[PDB]
Design a protein around this ligand. Structure first.
Ligand code: NDP
Ligand code: NDP
Ligand code: T3
Ligand code: T3
Ligand code: K
Ligand code: K
Lengths: 304, 303
């Protein structure tokens, strides 16, 4: 038995600079995962252990991928540096723990990448306007990859605290139009990203342009929601994992919306991408996404 | 973020030298676990992820203890070799404080819980100890049992006789190596089964009435160390009912009824029927690793 490598957030960052290297293996993983028993992924739905005394939670997210031949576990905490994560990478041939690495950078990057994959498939024709609700870590990681991958004529932002949206707009490279309400930000928007910690709906279907695509990334708890019933039930609903969406997403559970497809099914050709219709991609994240990122990082680090 | 501490196997051993210090917090943890919600332990049943391509398995064992105010996760692999690591978090903010070897922790806490069960359940006049198996668990059980108890004779059987002789010459006191399980258990007051046998090796017919058995091996729903006569005739104690019903082939395949959790005995909710033949079926649970990891981390961080 020997000690694992430790890779800091900076070291992870140094080995995850290129979305063109992250997107392809994510697409493959989503597809393989959605094949279920016809693929090679073993991923139990995330386990959450409450830490009631301190208003905290520990998420446990193991996965094995036969196709990548990779074995990982992400451990994530949230306390009401509030979000923290670590990823463990094992030698799949003998179980040895090879690496413990920061999970924060990975969470930022793989989440944004999965949203970008969904948007490539689901954005309507004439997607000129992007709208981001929220101004935190995920707002930044999404903005980064979306402006790399796509060309929008306008990017808009609303945030609960306007000052933080204005800081965002000052910090990032391109022009961001800070809006005074959600309604203003989303009216006329073709692609929407919701990356907030809202617990009750902030985005109402009445305001959404027919055909818009929404990446619904927040409200990551079964009692929490970012979207109203009109939007959840009017939109064609795509998810990352059916099992996770029906356990963890308040938007899905409380609206009672039918799930049309997993993103992986669209990628593999099993289900259609109805980009012309108003679409919601409800994202929860899942262990195999962390596995893909951790493997990329580890392979890059270990090869020099 | 601050880098976590990494504690190797030898550093863990260096900070778990005293069973005297490990037993009391384990007793409290077992009692609190068995109290259920009001005991403050959050411990989901072990998740096992198969790695079929390499004939392996990953088990993930998280726990929170309100009483100790500690948050851990053990990750263990078994490949058809067992390797474990324990992560210890700051419970107030989720920061990863330590990554430590899990093999030494597992060896120590398992032996300690067997010792707790044995203190409660060994028959009056217990003079003879028998160990079946001769691997890591045999060593840890031997160390703590000869420290906590006073046996007049210790016997051992192992499938491979050479490894039992190596054990007998390696450990401090006298060990009588026996050529069969039956020989080793005949007349024994306390028995420890620490093998990877998949089919029964220990038959109730051979067990002295009143004997206490710590059944530590066959840690899979399709594996067994004990026969039906022993499992059905003995008073059956476990660490976790839920885990025993999911993970133990001895319990599942025999159809035996579980009398009590060890924690219920400790708290007084269930009696210790030490006069009867008793089996403590140990699966292990996350809160035991939590106790040991906290003791280790606290000792190490103190200097
Ligand atoms: N689908 C997935 O895979 C992943 C999901 N997430 C989820 O994404 C969301 C954003 O995460 P992250 O960027 O790291 O978090 P951050 O803490 O960095 O930012 C949180 C954002 O939510 C806003 N906010 C907090 N409370 C409310 C509220 N009551 N109403 C409206 N906005 C609010 C904040 O605004 P303000 O400036 O006013 O404080 C801020 O813009 C979270 O819900 C998170 O759980 C994260 C990663 C994985
Ligand atoms: N209840 C709990 O909390 C814990 C449970 N365990 C379980 O305890 C047992 C021992 O673990 P450990 O000491 O680490 O393992 P080791 O690998 O160190 O030793 C294995 C032992 O099992 C024997 N053995 C292997 N196959 C058979 C067989 N078919 N029949 C009879 N004996 C056999 C070996 O004998 P030989 O020399 O001939 O190979 C050896 O004595 C295992 O079953 C393990 O899963 C351990 C961790 C915690
Ligand atoms: N959503 C991000 C960050 C995040 C992680 C965790 I653990 C969180 O706590 C809970 C609490 C109860 C639950 O039932 C669930 I599901 C999650 C929250 I709120 C957010 C991620 O997945 O990393
Ligand atoms: N018993 C020791 C070591 C150990 C750990 C693991 I993961 C093992 O593999 C499986 C495979 C399928 C299962 O259903 C179960 I339950 C366990 C085995 I065999 C042994 C411990 O608990 O650490
Ligand atoms: K659309
Ligand atoms: K007894």
């Amino acid at each position: 038995k020997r000690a694992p490598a430790f890779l800091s957030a900076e070291e992870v960052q140094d080995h995850l600079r290129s979305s063109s290297l992250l997107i392809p293996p994510l697409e493959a993983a989503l597809a393989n995962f959605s094949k279920g028993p016809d693929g090679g992924v073993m991923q139990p739905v995330r386990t959450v252990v409450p830490v009631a005394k301190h208003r905290g939670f520990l998420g446990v997210m193991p996965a094995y991928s036969a196709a990548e031949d990779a074995l990982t576990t992400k451990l994530v905490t949230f306390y009401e540096p509030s979000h923290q994560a670590s990823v463990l990478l094992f030698d799949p041939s003998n179980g040895s723990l090879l690496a413990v690495m920061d999970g924060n950078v990975i969470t930022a990057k793989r989440t944004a990448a999965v949203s970008a994959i969904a948007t490539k498939l689901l954005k309507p024709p004439g997607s000129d306007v992007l709208c981001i609700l929220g101004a935190g870590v995920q707002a930044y990681s999404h903005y980064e990859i979306f402006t790399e991958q796509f060309s929008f004529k306008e990017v808009r932002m609303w945030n609960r605290t306007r000052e933080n949206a204005e800081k965002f707009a000052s910090t990032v490279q391109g022009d961001v139009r800070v809006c005074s309400s959600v309604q203003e930000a989303v009216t006329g928007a073709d692609v929407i990203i919701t990356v907030t910690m809202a617990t009750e709906p902030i985005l109402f279907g009445e305001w959404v342009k027919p055909g818009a695509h929404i990446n619904a990334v927040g409200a990551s708890r079964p009692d929490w929601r970012e979207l109203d019933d009109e939007l959840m039930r009017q939109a064609v609903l795509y998810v990352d994992s059916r099992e996770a969406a029906l356990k963890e997403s308040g938007d899905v559970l409380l609206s009672g919306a039918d799930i049309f497809a997993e993103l992986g099914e669209v990628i593999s050709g099993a289900k259609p991408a109805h980009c012309e219709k108003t679409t919601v991609f409800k994202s929860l994240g899942m262990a195999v996404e962390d596995l893909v990122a951790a493997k990329l990082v580890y392979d890059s680090w270990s090869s020099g």
